[PDB]
């Protein structure tokens, strides 16, 4: 086909017409991933060195898309990734992605292809991660995310904008902190989540690509809130998180296209686990439609859905039981906040019957978690049933058996 040597040699040939066709021929074959060959390792490296020197000096406006395409393809290789991880190479991409604090009109295809290059370099090059922080790309990247309602940007550039935001905040502590503290990240991404859901008549089904965007938003929101929320929050912050929690309540009650409904709820529940737990009362504020689950004059659709997610997530896991802790701690706080919730979950999880650990029952799988290797999963499992048991040690011992309940009574002191 179009080998990397022949593309390199075509570049050593000075004619711009053969380099244009040889790049397009290379961009057609190697666009998919199974074209990757360990035999063409060095020939891909020497071609990157040729292209990078053009990029950090300026790409001609004509055929600019095909030049970024070959770099986006070569950026999938960890060997050629170094050559582009330079201060001016990443400044060129940031300018073509329009997030470089330069302009102070957009070709949507050059804009998107640059974003995919930055995502590949930031993903695996710690030098690119450092230089992207230093270039403060998060500033105008968060700004474009806030103008998504005014500026009709395509789905692809919206997805890779949010993915780069995800990669920057996951891989750089400083960028994660300035999105939260200086760039109003929670409030900004909360508005982006609502726009992506079409909320404000509940949301029942989310389209395939609106789900893809919303999951990435939930991932960035998880990053900037995982350790930055004090839970001793302002009255203004408590309203912001209660607003965000209301959006997550819609996600809990909704469905996504494809099989993504499982991943979609997991991201939702993960974010709920980061909220100030007094803001979780929003989960119980859902007013009673008729077409509901009712318990003691309170809507229990939300808590039934979380319970369903717990029972499903409990089945799939074998040794990654950590992914069950977020829904457990959300359901535990509801049972503390609410009395009809404490009583509804007690009937569903620990119904009066007549061997606490043996069995395929939900009560049995939970008691098995009280004897576990992870210290957090074993504590959230016991605390859940303990709260459901009205925090009574004798009743707590009856349902869980004393052998399993000894850890909770000893650790609590």
């Amino acid at each position: 086909g179009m080998e990397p040597r022949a593309v390199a040699d075509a570049l050593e040939t000075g004619e711009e017409d053969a380099v244009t066709e040889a790049l397009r021929s290379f961009n057609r074959e190697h666009s998919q991933s199974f074209t990757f060959d360990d035999a063409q390792q060095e020939d891909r490296k020497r071609l990157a060195k040729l292209l990078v020197s053009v990029l950090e000096q300026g790409l001609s406006p004509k055929h600019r898309v095909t030049w970024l395409q070959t770099i986006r393809i070569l950026s999938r290789d960890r060997s050629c990734l170094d050559s582009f991880a330079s201060r001016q190479s990443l400044h060129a991409l940031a300018c073509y992605a329009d997030i470089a604090i330069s302009e102070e009109p957009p070709d949507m295809d050059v804009l998107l292809e640059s974003l995919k290059c930055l995502c590949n370099l930031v993903l695996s090059s710690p030098t690119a991660q450092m230089l992207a922080a230093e270039a403060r790309l998060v500033v105008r990247l968060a700004e474009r995310v806030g103008l998504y309602r005014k500026r009709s940007y395509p789905h692809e550039v919206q997805f890779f904008d949010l993915r780069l935001l995800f990669l920057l905040t996951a891989l750089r502590t400083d960028v994660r902190q300035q999105l939260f503290q200086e760039l109003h990240g929670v409030r900004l991404l909360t508005d982006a989540l609502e726009l992506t859901l079409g909320v404000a008549n509940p949301l029942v089904i989310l389209p395939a690509q609106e789900t893809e965007r919303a999951m990435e938003i939930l991932k960035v929101l998880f990053n900037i809130t995982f350790d930055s929320v004090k839970r001793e929050v302002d009255e203004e912050d408590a309203a912001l998180y209660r607003y965000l929690g209301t959006l997550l309540r819609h996600c809990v009650m909704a469905d996504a296209a494809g099989d993504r409904t499982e991943e979609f709820h997991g991201h939702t529940v993960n974010l709920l686990g980061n909220l100030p737990l007094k803001c979780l009362d929003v989960l119980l504020a859902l007013e009673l439609h008729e077409g509901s689950l009712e318990f003691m004059g309170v809507n229990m659709d939300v808590i039934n859905a979380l319970l369903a997610f717990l029972e499903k997530r409990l089945h799939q896991t074998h040794r990654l039981k950590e992914c069950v802790a977020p829904v457990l701690s959300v359901l535990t706080e509801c049972a503390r906040m609410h009395r009809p919730a404490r009583k509804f979950l007690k009937a569903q999880v620990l119904p009066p019957l007549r061997r606490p650990e043996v069995g395929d029952l939900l009560r049995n799988k939970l008691v098995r978690l009280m004897t576990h290797l992870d210290t957090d999963v074993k504590r959230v499992a016991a605390e859940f049933l303990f709260v459901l048991c009205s925090e009574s040690v004798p009743r707590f011992i009856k349902y869980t058996g004393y052998g399993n309940a000894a850890g909770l009574l000893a650790a609590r002191g």
Side-chain angles (χ1 to χ4, degrees):
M2 191 80 230
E3 292 316 288
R5 302 197 63 124
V7 169
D9 304 345
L11 281 163
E12 311 202 339
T13 287
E15 62 171 310
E16 68 178 2
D17 278 70
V19 312
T20 307
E21 263 307 311
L23 285 187
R24 301 217 205 89
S25 185
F26 183 89
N27 292 340
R28 175 187 205 256
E29 151 148 29
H30 306 81
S31 270
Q32 310 137 10
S33 308
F34 76 96
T35 87
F36 208 78
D37 199 331
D38 280 354
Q40 326 172 275
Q41 205 85 316
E42 321 166 310
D43 308 311
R44 257 190 279 97
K45 189 149 40 162
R46 319 298 129 78
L47 164 65
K49 280 194 278 299
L50 264 58
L51 299 162
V52 64
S53 99
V54 187
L55 170 72
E56 55 200 5
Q57 289 228 118
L59 296 173
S60 292
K62 304 321 150 184
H63 312 123
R64 192 181 278 173
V65 185
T66 50
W67 277 76
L68 297 169
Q69 250 204 277
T70 318
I71 301 165
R72 186 210 71 192
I73 288 172
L74 296 195
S75 67
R76 299 177 192 155
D77 184 15
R78 302 170 122 240
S79 83
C80 325
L81 196 90
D82 179 4
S83 52
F84 305 105
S86 91
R87 211 178 305 252
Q88 35 276 305
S89 162
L90 294 172
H91 173 78
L93 303 170
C95 285
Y96 297 151
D98 196 45
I99 49 175
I101 326 170
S102 204
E103 301 271 59
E104 169 82 84
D107 187 59
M108 226 57 90
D109 294 280
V110 157
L111 194 87
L112 167 68
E113 216 70 18
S114 320
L115 290 168
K116 301 201 262 217
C117 296
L118 293 166
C119 286
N120 295 335
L121 296 154
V122 167
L123 172 63
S124 34
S125 161
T127 294
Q129 306 167 6
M130 147 164 37
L131 297 172
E134 182 193 83
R136 307 248 305 165
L137 306 182
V138 70
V139 173
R140 294 230 298 164
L141 208 49
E143 194 199 286
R144 188 148 71 199
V145 160
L147 307 190
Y148 275 161
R149 52 213 330 157
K150 310 198 298 156
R151 271 52 133 175
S152 43
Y153 275 99
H155 164 79
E156 288 291 292
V157 315
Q158 278 185 277
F159 169 79
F160 280 91
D161 270 353
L162 288 158
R163 160 150 195 79
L164 189 55
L165 223 45
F166 161 79
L167 293 178
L168 289 167
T169 62
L171 298 164
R172 284 293 297 208
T173 293
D174 57 335
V175 179
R176 176 163 77 257
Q177 285 171 352
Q178 58 201 228
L179 185 58
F180 179 77
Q181 278 286 358
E182 305 175 337
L183 300 169
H184 305 112
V186 169
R187 145 162 297 104
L188 152 73
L189 295 156
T190 298
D191 290 352
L193 182 57
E194 178 157 44
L195 186 271
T196 321
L197 301 178
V199 153
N201 234 341
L203 161 73
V204 190
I205 169 70
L206 205 59
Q209 83 178 26
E210 264 82 20
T211 288
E212 254 208 351
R213 289 209 308 278
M215 286 189 303
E216 289 277 328
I217 298 175
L218 297 159
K219 286 202 269 179
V220 182
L221 277 159
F222 179 87
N223 282 351
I224 74 179
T225 59
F226 176 59
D227 58 1
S228 52
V229 178
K230 275 193 170 79
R231 222 234 71 90
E232 316 120 308
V233 297
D234 188 296
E235 260 76 52
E236 186 82 81
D237 283 350
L240 178 48
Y241 294 122
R242 276 186 171 107
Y243 194 103
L244 171 59
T246 312
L247 302 174
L248 306 178
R249 188 180 73 209
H250 309 332
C251 307
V252 164
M253 300 298 310
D255 292 281
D259 321 283
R260 311 280 260 167
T261 318
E262 264 205 299
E263 304 158 41
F264 177 73
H265 281 145
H267 295 312
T268 299
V269 175
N270 286 350
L271 191 59
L272 277 164
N274 295 0
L275 295 178
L277 48 87
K278 74 171 179 180
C279 307
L280 293 186
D281 59 2
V282 164
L283 293 180
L284 284 147
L286 184 56
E287 270 154 60
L288 193 40
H289 58 197
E290 274 66 21
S292 61
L293 163 61
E294 159 81 20
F295 204 100
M296 295 178 51
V298 170
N299 193 328
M300 289 293 164
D301 289 320
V302 279
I303 297 209
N304 202 78
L306 288 162
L307 187 59
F309 179 79
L310 162 63
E311 193 133 36
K312 173 169 65 176
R313 267 264 86 186
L314 217 32
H315 192 226
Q316 274 203 135
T317 168
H318 168 233
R319 295 187 324 175
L320 267 182
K321 299 279 176 181
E322 281 205 272
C323 312
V324 157
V327 64
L328 282 180
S329 49
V330 164
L331 283 168
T332 301
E333 186 45 52
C334 294
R336 293 184 200 255
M337 262 159 24
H338 210 29
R339 298 204 258 165
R342 177 209 85 165
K343 261 149 176 166
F344 166 75
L345 289 156
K346 157 75 173 109
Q348 298 291 323
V349 178
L350 317 163
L353 269 178
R354 215 168 309 150
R355 303 87 68 182
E357 314 82 307
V358 160
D360 203 61
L361 295 314
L362 172 63
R363 140 188 157 262
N364 290 103
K365 313 199 79 180
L366 251 26
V367 169
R368 288 196 274 276
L369 295 168
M370 304 174 60
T371 86
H372 208 264
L373 298 324
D374 178 286
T375 47
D376 202 53
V377 197
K378 78 196 302 270
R379 180 196 47 83
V380 303
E383 190 79 36
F384 176 57
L385 300 184
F386 186 58
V387 167
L388 256 54
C389 288
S390 308
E391 292 174 74
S392 161
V393 169
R395 180 163 35 229
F396 175 62
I397 282 171
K398 172 212 296 174
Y399 287 97
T400 63
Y402 180 77
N404 323 278
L408 185 270
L409 323 161
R412 176 90 140 71

